[PDB]
Write an enzyme that holds these catalytic residues in place. Structure first.
Site, PDB file in Angstrom:
ATOM      1  N   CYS A   1      -6.375   2.426   4.918  1.00  0.00           N
ATOM      2  CA  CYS A   1      -6.946   1.223   5.497  1.00  0.00           C
ATOM      3  C   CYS A   1      -6.465   1.068   6.961  1.00  0.00           C
ATOM      4  CB  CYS A   1      -6.552  -0.005   4.673  1.00  0.00           C
ATOM      5  SG  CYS A   1      -4.903  -0.746   5.041  1.00  0.00           S
ATOM      6  N   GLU A  25       0.804   3.935   1.582  1.00  0.00           N
ATOM      7  CA  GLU A  25       1.176   4.444   2.903  1.00  0.00           C
ATOM      8  C   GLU A  25       2.423   3.784   3.480  1.00  0.00           C
ATOM      9  OE1 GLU A  25      -3.324   4.762   2.355  1.00  0.00           O
ATOM     10  OE2 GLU A  25      -1.832   3.251   1.986  1.00  0.00           O
ATOM     11  N   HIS A  29       0.817  -1.191   0.000  1.00  0.00           N
ATOM     12  CA  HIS A  29       0.000   0.000   0.000  1.00  0.00           C
ATOM     13  C   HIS A  29       0.860   1.253   0.000  1.00  0.00           C
ATOM     14  CE1 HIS A  29      -3.770  -2.161   1.749  1.00  0.00           C
ATOM     15  NE2 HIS A  29      -3.325  -2.705   0.630  1.00  0.00           N
ATOM     16  N   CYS A  71      -2.705   0.133   7.630  1.00  0.00           N
ATOM     17  CA  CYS A  71      -1.833   1.247   7.309  1.00  0.00           C
ATOM     18  C   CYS A  71      -1.948   2.344   8.349  1.00  0.00           C
ATOM     19  CB  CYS A  71      -2.113   1.809   5.920  1.00  0.00           C
ATOM     20  SG  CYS A  71      -1.406   0.812   4.637  1.00  0.00           S
TER      21      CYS A  71
HETATM   22 ZN   LIG Z   1      -3.354   0.117   3.665  1.00  0.00          ZN
END
Ligand SMILES: [Zn+2]
Ligand SMILES: [Cl-]
Ligand SMILES: [Mg+2]
Ligand SMILES: [Zn+2]
Length: 188
Positions: A95, A66, A64, A98
């Site tokens: 999310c 992040e 991801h 993260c």
């Molecule tokens: Zn995430």
């Protein structure tokens, strides 16, 4: 090195709720250093990135945005005795896992003040809201992108060829609705 393609920007940062297909997360970042009580932009620190595709081997999700953002921060070689404000402009909010990881990062790196300004809220009706509340509690300033932030991203991160920012339909409406939704999440 290249700036962001305008259609990529427009497609991803569009805050219209009733379209689908924005599977990616784009993340634009800037860094400031506190100098004599004034925040000062460090323009060599500017950049953007996106989430990664999963490896062909399978099983694991693609990293991801992040986490990749968190991955690069140490290479900035920031002075642990100094104070920095790090601002992310994100197409989606983090999310849960993260958010959790970002909360841990800012917990352990007191020299960084993190501001997250997001085009849209991703709420999976599961732990996403917990994650935002947890990230805020750890000291991150989470807010919704308005006209002002979208234009800034356009001017700063997009390969615009002198073209001015043109707001898409409903930008202010959606932004206002999201700000309200975020207030309810963060006071909830
Ligand atoms: Zn995430
Ligand atoms: Cl979408
Ligand atoms: Mg609309
Ligand atoms: Zn792998």
């Amino acid at each position: 090195r290249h700036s962001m393609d305008p259609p990529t920007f427009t497609f991803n940062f569009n805050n219209e709720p009733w379209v689908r297909g924005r599977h990616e997360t784009y993340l634009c970042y800037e860094v400031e250093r506190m100098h004599n009580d004034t925040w000062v932009k460090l323009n060599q620190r500017r950049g953007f990135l996106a989430n990664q595709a999963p490896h062909k081997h399978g099983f694991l999700e693609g990293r991801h945005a992040e986490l990749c953002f968190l991955d690069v921060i140490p290479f900035w070689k920031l002075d642990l005795d100094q104070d920095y404000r790090v601002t992310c402009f994100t197409s989606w909010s983090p999310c849960f896992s993260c958010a959790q990881e970002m909360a841990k990062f800012i917990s352990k790196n007191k020299h960084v003040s993190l501001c997250i300004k997001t085009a849209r809220i991703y709420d999976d009706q599961g732990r996403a809201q917990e994650g935002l509340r947890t990230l805020a509690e750890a000291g991150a300033k989470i807010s919704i992108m308005t006209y002002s932030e979208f234009k800034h991203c356009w001017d700063t991160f997009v390969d615009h060829q002198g073209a001015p920012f043109q707001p898409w339909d409903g930008l202010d409406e959606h932004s206002q609705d999201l700000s309200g939704r975020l207030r309810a999440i963060l006071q909830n």
